[PDB]
Amino acid sequence: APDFHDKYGNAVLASGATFCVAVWVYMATQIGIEWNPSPVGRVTPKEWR
Amino acid sequence: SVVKSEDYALPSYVDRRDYPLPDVAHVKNLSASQKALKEKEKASWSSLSIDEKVELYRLKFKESFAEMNRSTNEWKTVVGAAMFFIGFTALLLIWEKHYVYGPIPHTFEEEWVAKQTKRMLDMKVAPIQGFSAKWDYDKNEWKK
Amino acid sequence: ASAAKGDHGGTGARTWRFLTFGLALPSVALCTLNSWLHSGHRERPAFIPYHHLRIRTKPFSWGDGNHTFFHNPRVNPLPTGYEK
Amino acid sequence: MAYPMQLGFQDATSPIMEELLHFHDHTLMIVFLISSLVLYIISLMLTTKLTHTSTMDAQEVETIWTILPAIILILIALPSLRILYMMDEINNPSLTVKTMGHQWYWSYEYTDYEDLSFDSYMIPTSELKPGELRLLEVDNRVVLPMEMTIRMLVSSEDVLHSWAVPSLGLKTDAIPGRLNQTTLMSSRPGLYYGQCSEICGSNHSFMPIVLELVPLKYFEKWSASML
Amino acid sequence: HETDEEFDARWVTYFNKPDIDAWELRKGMNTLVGYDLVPEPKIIDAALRACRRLNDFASAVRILEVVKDKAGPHKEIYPYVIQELRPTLNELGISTPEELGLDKV
Amino acid sequence: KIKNYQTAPFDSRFPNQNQTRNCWQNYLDFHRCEKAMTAKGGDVSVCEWYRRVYKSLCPISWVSTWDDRRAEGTFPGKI
Amino acid sequence: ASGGGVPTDEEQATGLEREVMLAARKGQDPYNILAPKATSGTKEDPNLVPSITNKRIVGCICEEDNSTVIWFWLHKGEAQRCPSCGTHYKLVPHQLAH
Amino acid sequence: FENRVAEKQKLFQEDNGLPVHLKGGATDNILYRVTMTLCLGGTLYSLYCLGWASFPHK
Amino acid sequence: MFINRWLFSTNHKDIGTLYLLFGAWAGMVGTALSLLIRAELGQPGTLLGDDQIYNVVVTAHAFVMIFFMVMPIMIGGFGNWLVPLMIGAPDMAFPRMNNMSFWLLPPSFLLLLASSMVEAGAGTGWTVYPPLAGNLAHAGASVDLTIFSLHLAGVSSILGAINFITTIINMKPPAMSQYQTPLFVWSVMITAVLLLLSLPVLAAGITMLLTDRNLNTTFFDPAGGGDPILYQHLFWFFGHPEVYILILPGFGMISHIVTYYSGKKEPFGYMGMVWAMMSIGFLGFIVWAHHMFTVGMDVDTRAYFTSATMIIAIPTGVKVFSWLATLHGGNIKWSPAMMWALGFIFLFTVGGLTGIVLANSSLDIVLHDTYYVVAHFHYVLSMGAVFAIMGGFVHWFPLFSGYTLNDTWAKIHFAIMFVGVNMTFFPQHFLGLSGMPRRYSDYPDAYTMWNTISSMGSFISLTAVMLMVFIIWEAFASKREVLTVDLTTTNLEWLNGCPPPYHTFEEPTYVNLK
Amino acid sequence: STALAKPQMRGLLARRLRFHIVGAFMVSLGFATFYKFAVAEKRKKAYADFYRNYDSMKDFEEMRKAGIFQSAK
Amino acid sequence: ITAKPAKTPTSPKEQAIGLSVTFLSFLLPAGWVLYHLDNYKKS
Amino acid sequence: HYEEGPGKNIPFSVENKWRLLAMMTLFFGSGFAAPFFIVRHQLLKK
Amino acid sequence: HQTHAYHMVNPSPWPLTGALSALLMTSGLTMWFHFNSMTLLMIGLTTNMLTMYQWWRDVIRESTFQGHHTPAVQKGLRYGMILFIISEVLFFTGFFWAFYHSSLAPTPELGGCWPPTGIHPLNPLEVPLLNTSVLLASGVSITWAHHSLMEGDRKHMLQALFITITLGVYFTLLQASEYYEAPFTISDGVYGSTFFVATGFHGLHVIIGSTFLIVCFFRQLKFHFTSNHHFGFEAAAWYWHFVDVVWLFLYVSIYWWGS
Ligand code: HEA
Ligand code: HEA
Ligand SMILES: CCCCC/C=C/C/C=C/C/C=C/C/C=C\CCCC(=O)O[C@H](COC(=O)CCCCCCCCCCCCCCCCC)COP(=O)(O)OCCN
């Protein structure tokens, strides 16, 4: 006789994975967090003096 | 069959790969037909039917090796659920960014950064490997 | 060492009482003599307000905060010198 | 200075710091190897249905697992100790400079010939000039001659501080009533930054160190101009 | 220690004791499966016959299961053993776990 | 005269990280010498090396406190 | 030099102290101060395990110097065997306090 | 002085169910109540003191 | 009835339970503190205020995690519950004194909270170095409250160590030699010895700080001919042994847990494990100045402390390898406790190795007072000690309570914690190598990325801590009663049932001498 | 109707251990070789190459003209 | 280990409650403080 | 003498799982809340 | 009914009142140092004394009057006391470390010498020598006491123990008087600091030990001890030797070598 995991395993895995990826991607890119990546290959140096 | 708390000091039954013949039978009380079966077991086992043999097995043991060693779908629940709570953590971080944190220093504005980066290059910050090493001073650009 | 006496046949009450009254107490009596002789108030030294002494980083929690606990007027100057 | 996303040590500025980089590569290799071996053997122990649960004899394999780590420690300690003695070698400095820790800034004294001393405070974030570094710039840098052996003497006039400049492999605690000595020698001109490295109260995070390495001639004229 | 043949003989003799009791049957099997080996057919033969003398069909089948288990991923071992035990299994009327459906989860 | 000083040289008496005693010692030596010379009718200039060394090594505040204490009669060292 | 006036244990020991002391004098060990000595531990010569109830935990150090002790309840009735070495133990219930 | 230990042994071995710290009689109870009162009282008072010290008095 | 039982206890299991309760509560406090740390450092700039409030938080975090969560749970809790049961003893030697060891802790904790409420708190670091901790840089009652808090915790532990040593030496079955006692018991005994020897030295040191602050002594004040460095020697003479105190009972529980879930009757190389714990215990008294490589110490002293510190790797290595050898050939049960233990073996090894990096005074010049130290010690404490506590807790909860946890939930909990602590601490290695100092409320902009990721990891841990509370509630809410436990023949503590009776071993076990 | 061959039936666990510990050892040497090439030698050659023809005055001069120094305009 | 079935089973719904209430008891008070931090920092 | 057995060897009641939830909540919650309220207390002084 | 020989103690309030009294004394000290008040302190000291009194009373009840101290219990108490004494040795060790640290590397503030400039140490051949002969003699009289008790001699036990206490009391009075007479104070830099704190904790231990001896004296008057069971006396005696040995180390280090 099928247990909790046999009945809900696939759903808990699928919707767990989807939720976690979605909300981490959202938090990482949409709310103004400054990650301060390397300037290397991304910043054009500008005159400062 | 039915195990009680106040039997802890008695020899008990276990299903374990590495303890194949436990200290007691799975089933200790026997019905009339079960008694007759234990009697028949004293004669040639060739005269036992398949059903009778299964029944003798099931009197002695609870689960077979195959049953006891079976794998399950628990991992899905576990991994799924962990991802869910890690996901939930992101909501706490979102709440914190919105309601707790103020603006970050002005030194992270894009123009500040671009100026700081030049200055770091003019000062040859990490010129051997770390930073300036990656800048082509001849072609005035990041090393491809 | 082995001291300079002997017994050791059996260390009992009698022996330890022997040592109490034959050696220990007499030594205490001798040292008491020696002490109650070399005593007498030696003349207190000139006061010099050395900065490593009479430390006060916080007032003491008794008296006027400026006297040590067993302050003796005769021999313990305050940070500003001997008392009247 | 450190740069965004940095994983390892700041680039070496002195021969000593270069020495520590090579010794750290050597140790780190050993750290990866051992911890990756441990992880590997765990997984090995865990990935078989074969069993052997009877009493295992120990006095044989215990040799291997005592002698091997002993050999490894000696292979660390040797280069460790060579470096340690190098750092202690007599060198004859050309110049002595004192620094005194304070809540919350550093003062420097160059008193070989004239009486030169001044205070060195963090530039407030609101007053950074464009391209300057938050929490790292000071009003008055420690100008020093490049390519010369300098004796740094370190102390404090109040609580503990510690004077550090990661690029030069330096960190010397600043203890009141005590005069700690270290030596500094930059292979290159430039600016080399560090930060107070003993908890010293409300502004511990905000009393940085900035070394300005330049040629002797410019160092002399700076000194003079600073009296 | 001792040679492989001495070990096996020691175990054969253990199980072949005519008046071996239930406790010694269990102690024997439970000890034997602790070792890093799948018992030789001759040892299993002796254990099975002890099961017969003790009128214990179920333990005979459980012994065959433990042989399988002890081989781990070496799938060749168990069927070799059964093959070698076949005259004994026929003589004693011992059905294999597979014949009994006890290999299905 | 025998000078041309850059900084205090290595001194085998104080070879370690703690240089407190090196300052102190050279501070005492200078002021000892100064007192010897000022008394017996001679010249302070022979005291000069100690003066340079202590000046190079000692924190200003230490020297400054020591000098105040010598004036006050509270200097704990022997001069 | 000498006299008396200090009570002895014989005169003044009481409660459980007194019980241990009197028991020791008759060579007995009702309070399990001593390590019992093994018999040969066969079916015929089992280790005799005293008890004031109908079961007692035995710990069997199978071979001299084993660091591993094998623990099990010994029940009133037929001798049981140590599950590791098979030595036999038999419970001998009751009494101690008369 | 005479040896009265036997009387004290009888008293403390009396089968009256009292814990040892109360077994001497009525004075045990009084002394216990004083002790516990001073401790509980003193503790409340230390909590009051912390409360007071927790705030500035300018 | 209730007061007699829980305030006047002389029972080793009840007192164990009080300690675990106390410990769990402390853990919540310690966790909050650590979220405050990581909230302040989660983006560049100032969140709470300057370094004072910040370091008040850092200081309380360490005191709470060390003296109120770890030691009470391992020694007070598991020690009291398990040690008497594992040697078949009817209780501890000094059952009443045992209770006082417990009741000293709430007042100790109350003193710690008081110091953070009066004045501006004690923002000193858990090491409490003068002159910052003295009466001019930290005027008023906070530091004195901290000192008194430590005095109470100290007395609690010294009396506890005396109790454990006496119990373990004196109260085994007559036939059981020391070499027949379980490894957990050994681990607690060795811990108790270190406590007995090291805490009085700390007591001396902090008393001296107390008198410099209040009675015009000058032990640590150059003005009066004292030395701030003397404090550091006294504190670390205690403080290194302290960390071995924090891990040893962990090692002990790891040995049982690994043995148990491998389906073995015994750990591999028992005598080797006893040897290793003893050696570690001894060596941990002769290495303290590795906390002081930057204070200005002679080169030869630095050479000695480097070398003596490194040797600790050898006995510790024997332990690690013996745990692996215990797994070898096991019938592995993948229980939640086993996962904690397996995590323990790997992550403790990592932290130990980064400790070996730090042992080299040469490199320590650059690493000292940076986040590389923080990453080393959180690997061995937040993943070491804590993993062993979790492993132990889930393994023995059914013995203590009579109920079972939901295993799935427990595995979920493990999984979240594991990601959390790794995300928190692994990046701090980078922050250290690149020079981020300790005890900063804010950092130069370059360090922003690893600090962000580290604070995110701390939030994941928070989630795991919350889930843990729910899990324990669920077990008590459901009331699944334990039936059968396997391997009782080599786990004496289980043999009287779950929970065991109030009084166990009223009739002692029977063990033949032979 | 072919019989099956007697397989190896003893020391299966031990044999697996030996095989993989030997494998772990081989991988360790392969990683040590890799690491002493992509990390340790790489680092020494970076520093060596940097300093081989390094001109500290030229470096200063570039720094000076860029304007970075308090003491040199 | 073997155990009896729960004497007072805790259903999915009941668990969701216990879990919500648990998380809430940790998040609400801290959240309150942190949210009003600015109000504290200058008042 | 004392109550023994599951749910009785403990200083808190587990008779009602909701009352228990409330207690655990107050208990672990007060632990976790304390430092935040201490921080608040320090902020609101000076 | 138990069939082992150890003591299951009656549930007791003394651990709690003990712990609370620690809270009252430490709070009290805080209050005294910072809030100019002695009241918490006095309460703490009072409950502390009441705790100790009842707790040890109960131990006497449990042993002399109830018979719980079987040999196995007595053996436990022995280890307990030994372990306790070891912990006290380490405590003192910290103060000696501090002493040797300051005096072996006297800093410039002191004049760079030891004793520091402006410190005039006590003559070790005067009262400190007397103090040494006092404690040493007391070591002898207490051994006589022990032997008399083992030989069953009531009167000579009492005499020797009395003598031992009188000597303890003597040392204390001499030390009080030295403290008063000393021209240096606890505030005279690290010299006064190490001197008064080390000899001060020592003096405290002499008082504790004397008190323990006086308890023994009264229990003996009341016939509690038998010629073979008298742990409380042994414990007091070990403690007393400890006190004597710490004195000899103080004398050699601080009074003699540090002068
Ligand atoms: C449980 C706590 C714990 C434990 C067990 C340890 C264990 C060790 N610790 Fe540390 N440590 C701390 C907690 C702990 N530590 C804390 C809290 C601090 C900071 C104090 C403060 O400033 O606040 C600190 C600080 C600290 C420093 C000071 C750094 C600094 O401040 O500058 C040093 C330097 O030597 C050090 C070293 C070590 C070493 C060598 C070990 C060794 O015991 C580890 C030995 C283990 C292994 C090596 C791994 C297992 C072995 C093998 C797999 C075999 C093969 C290994 C080799 C061949 C090397 N630790
Ligand atoms: C055991 C000790 C311990 C533990 C477990 C931790 C856990 C954590 N620590 Fe801590 N830390 C220290 C001891 C510890 N710490 C010390 C000593 C210092 C140095 C202080 C100083 O510089 O003076 C320090 C410093 C320190 C700093 C540096 C401060 C600075 O230099 O500015 C940081 C920042 O990231 C940090 C963060 C964390 C985090 C996020 C956790 C998280 O991983 C925590 C997640 C929560 C848990 C792991 C625990 C819960 C366990 C229970 C609740 C018991 C459960 C109950 C039962 C099982 C019944 N810590
Ligand atoms: C007669 C010899 C017997 C000595 C005992 C004397 C009675 C006073 C009570 C205190 C006993 C405590 C012992 C040690 C405490 C510290 C110093 C005490 C030594 C002492 O008595 O020193 C006196 C200083 O007293 C001072 O400040 C003392 C001020 C009194 C405040 C006591 C401070 C309390 C400190 C609490 C520390 C407790 C922590 C210990 C923890 C133990 C482990 C948990 C010396 O006097 P002075 O005037 O400076 O010099 C003499 C000049 N003519």
Ligand SMILES: CCCCCC/C=C\CCCCCCCCCC(=O)O[C@H](COC(=O)CCCCCCCCCCCCCCC)COP(=O)(O)OC[C@@H](O)CO
């Ligand atoms: C102004 C004075 C106040 C100063 C504060 C401290 C006050 C004084 C403390 C003095 C200690 C008094 C201790 C009295 C103990 C009496 C109880 C006792 O001694 O109990 C004995 C057992 O020993 C036992 O528990 C052994 C118990 C040992 C106690 C050890 C004492 C050390 C306490 C130190 C506390 C201070 C900490 C130091 C600060 C740095 C009872 O066994 P027996 O003697 O065999 O009797 C039975 C026979 O009769 C049978 O025939």
Ligand SMILES: CCCCCCCCCCO[C@@H]1O[C@H](CO)[C@@H](O[C@H]2O[C@H](CO)[C@@H](O)[C@H](O)[C@@H]2O)[C@@H](O)[C@H]1O
């Ligand atoms: C470090 C660990 C902490 C992790 C982060 C906390 C997770 C978030 C939990 C939420 O807590 C609440 O959040 C609110 C808003 O979302 C609050 O409402 C406040 O703000 C409102 C909405 O703007 C008003 O309706 C109210 O008055 C109120 O004061 C506030 O009180 C608080 O209890």
Ligand code: CUA
């Ligand atoms: Cu100055 Cu930190």
Ligand SMILES: [Cu+2]
């Ligand atoms: Cu250490």
Ligand SMILES: [Mg+2]
């Ligand atoms: Mg430091």
Ligand code: NA
């Ligand atoms: Na910040």
Ligand SMILES: [Zn+2]
């Ligand atoms: Zn056995």
